[PDB]
Specification:
The structure is a homodimer. Chain A has 220 residues and is mostly helical. Chain A folds into two domains: 1-107; 110-220, no CATH class. Chain A contains eight helices and no strands. Chain A is elongated, with a radius of gyration of 20 Å. The relative contact order of chain A is 0.09. Chains A and B meet through helix 1, helix 2, helix 6 and helix 8 of A and helix 1, helix 2, helix 6 and helix 8 of B. It is classed as de novo protein. The entry lists the keywords de novo, torroid, derroid, tandem repeat, homodimer, computationally designed, C2 symmetric, DE novo protein. It forms a dimeric assembly.
């Protein structure tokens, strides 16, 4: 569609810039953006096909990616092109994780996982709307980054619920329940605090508690 | 038996978290590095579950990641660069496993002969990465190895296209693309510069992706 035409045109112009550069790492820097653009196009086409409320944000993320691609096409300095391509890549990763979340919420039966998924999607829809109204690509990236970790945290909450519901070790069962309650409190605290830097620290503090138990529960 | 890396990761993440608490936008910069370390640890667990030739390269990339992690623990902005090399190294190890199951399930002698060629180039970049000192130089070598592994995955997919396509027009064009890619891969072996190898593979992905996007 309009994505591959724009992507392939950005790669050719970026490749032609590397030819007349003559600088050591600057030529590699201009080929890394071109390589990231090709991977973005590969993710863009595969994410087009694969709850209508999740389909609305899918259009919003694709609309935002096309906006960042049109901005890179209307910019010259490869420094902001670099920044804009990795915002669209994070959006592509965010869209893929949203599909992964939509497939674990259809295969989950615990009412706390469903209630927590609605909470994380309210925070994600808020960060995504604030990203679509922002102008600085760094501000968009930070908000899309926080939305990305929120989706992964929800995926870890679903995995920990499977831990707790099938673990025979009572020590793991108690620790899993304690981690899950702390995660639910950290998500309620991330929803009560508007600062994305504070939302990010709560999610990292939740993943540290989740992965410490995942590493200990690991089959060896 | 080699998860002392998670001990190093969790020690770097917690130390980064304590810095962000007693710190504007710098607080976000210190937590994204911490977030990248957790994802690296998340890749460690994903590599725990999933051919001694693949187990030898697994130890080599983990040894390199442990070297980059030990440097980050003895260094004070630069951690971000060191963590993103280990992330590329973790991604490279994952792609080697994904290839090992398509390379074990393939019977076409032209795909195997081309797969052996790109893995010889990857083994050269990996050995040159283990001999480099600059983390930036290591990243460039692992980045080219990553795209080489991706190019081989596309070579396997294009070979399956031509061997199962009902349209003779699509089948004939696929062979022409694969021969052009085979010429670009042989030229990438003649040039030692990874920036020149990267350009040949980007020059090859453009021909592969153009037909894949057209073939609905």
């Amino acid at each position: 569609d309009e994505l591959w035409k724009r992507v392939k045109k950005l790669v050719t112009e970026l490749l032609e810039q590397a030819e007349r550069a003559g600088d050591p790492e600057e030529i590699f820097k201009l080929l890394e953006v071109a390589q990231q653009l090709l991977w973005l196009a590969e993710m863009f086409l595969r994410l087009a096909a694969i709850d209508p409320e999740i389909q609305e944000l899918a259009e919003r993320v694709l609309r935002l990616i096309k906006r960042l691609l049109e901005e890179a096409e209307r910019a010259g300095d490869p420094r902001r092109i670099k920044e804009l391509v990795e915002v669209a890549l994070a959006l592509a990763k965010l869209l893929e994780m949203f599909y992964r979340l939509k497939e674990i919420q259809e295969r989950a039966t615990d009412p706390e996982i469903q209630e927590l998924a609605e909470r994380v999607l309210r925070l994600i829809k808020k960060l995504l709307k604030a990203a679509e109204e922002a102008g600085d690509p760094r501000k968009i990236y930070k908000l899309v980054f926080v939305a990305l970790v929120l989706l992964h945290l929800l995926q870890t909450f679903y995995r920990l619920k499977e831990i707790q519901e099938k673990a025979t070790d009572p020590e793991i069962q108690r620790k899993a329940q304690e981690v899950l309650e702390k995660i639910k409190r950290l998500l309620e605290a991330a929803e009560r605090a508007g600062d994305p830097a504070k939302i990010l620290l709560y999610v990292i503090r939740a993943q540290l508690l989740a992965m410490e138990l995942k590493f200990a529960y690991r089959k060896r």
